[PDB]
């Protein structure tokens, strides 16, 4: 089982300028706790984890 990493209001959040932890990264869950806009995409029609 996991759970949660971290949370905070940003200390760890970046580190590289781009790559695989950048804002385009980091933006992956700007939409996720508010959901405003969408592009044909969804977490769970990706993956499907069933709360793991």
């Not at 089982?1 to 869950?29: I, P």
């Amino acid at each position: 089982y996991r759970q949660s990493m971290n949370n905070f209001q940003g200390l760890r959040s970046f580190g590289c300028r781009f790559g695989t932890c950048t804002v385009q990264k980091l933006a992956h869950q700007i939409y996720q706790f508010t959901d405003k806009d969408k592009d044909n995409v969804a977490p769970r029609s990706k993956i499907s984890p069933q709360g793991y």
